[PDB]
Amino acid sequence: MASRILLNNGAKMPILGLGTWKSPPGQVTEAVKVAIDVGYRHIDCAHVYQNENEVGVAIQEKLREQVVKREELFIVSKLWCTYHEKGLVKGACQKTLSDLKLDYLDLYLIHWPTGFKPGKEFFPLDESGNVVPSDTNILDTWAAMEELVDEGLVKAIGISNFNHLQVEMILNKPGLKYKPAVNQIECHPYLTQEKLIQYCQSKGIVVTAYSPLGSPDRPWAKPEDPSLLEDPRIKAIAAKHNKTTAQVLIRFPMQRNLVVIPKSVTPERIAENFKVFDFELSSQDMTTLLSYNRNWRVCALLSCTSHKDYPFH
Ligand SMILES: NC(=O)C1=CN([C@@H]2O[C@H](COP(=O)(O)OP(=O)(O)OC[C@H]3O[C@@H](n4cnc5c(N)ncnc54)[C@H](OP(=O)(O)O)[C@@H]3O)[C@@H](O)[C@H]2O)C=CC1
């Protein structure tokens, strides 16, 4: 398979990227260096992950070393929920740029549709534990994202964790200037997302699949939860193809015309996860993997469920 997918801004995006949520700051610089050395050209970042400075050290070193040129990298970050007001978006983007050692981002996403009260805390809570909303709305946050394109800070803008009605809301915005290029959503065999994916794809929006391995390192994991990497049925497909279960889980979204962003800080796994362009899942394999859907989510958060714009039900 071809390495890149065409976006509706006319740029090409690598279909495989390195995830960085939970990558410890003392490990992520090496992880990104190794990733670039073994062929990765897309890194998925976010301010809320608290490691963009260290990601940036790696990017800058590999550019300085001339392992890669900047035009060949595709760096993605995301606007956190406490920065949805008009007067905060540009500074949030610029902080990310400064940390990542970048003059521009290839793609900047609204991380979640929900705006929260600005301040130091990423999840401001009331005394009963509910997130404190801001009275920002999706559409005005989108207008702020559009300004970043028009200032040269970002090449593409998109959304993340937007449901069907929220994507539609963005597409139907009065005076819409730039369509979202990407909707980044959780997607794997236990949360196959057929409905949302077809809607977005039909609208020319590329979907990126996050937590493709089921995020085994998620901090809220419980022992009872299903485990993709350990599922007998997925292991059998991997065995048949002489690949690892992770490699199957990465190739699966690729064949659905998705971008996929597995995270690792383990050098051997960073390389393993890139070796997914030399085998094909059959249509029967694809349908079989799709059949494992159970509407099971890594990423959800009880404290945010009453926000007017919380995306999931
Ligand atoms: N937009 C959003 O709201 C969200 C975005 N994301 C993005 O998506 C990325 C990926 O999702 P994430 O939730 O991190 O989880 P993943 O599904 O990518 O799973 C990461 C875990 O899998 C392990 N792992 C990686 N490769 C292998 C392998 N070959 N064999 C076995 N285990 C392996 C990692 O271990 P180790 O690192 O120890 O090797 C880590 O524990 C995030 O890092 C982030 O960039 C994720 C959630 C939400």
Ligand SMILES: O=C(O)COc1cc(F)ccc1C(=S)NCc1ccc(Br)cc1F
């Ligand atoms: O969010 C990520 O990329 C990965 O996860 C996170 C990454 C972080 F660095 C900090 C918190 C999260 C959480 S708890 N994310 C879930 C979450 C946050 C906000 C809302 Br609205 C709903 C929700 F489900």
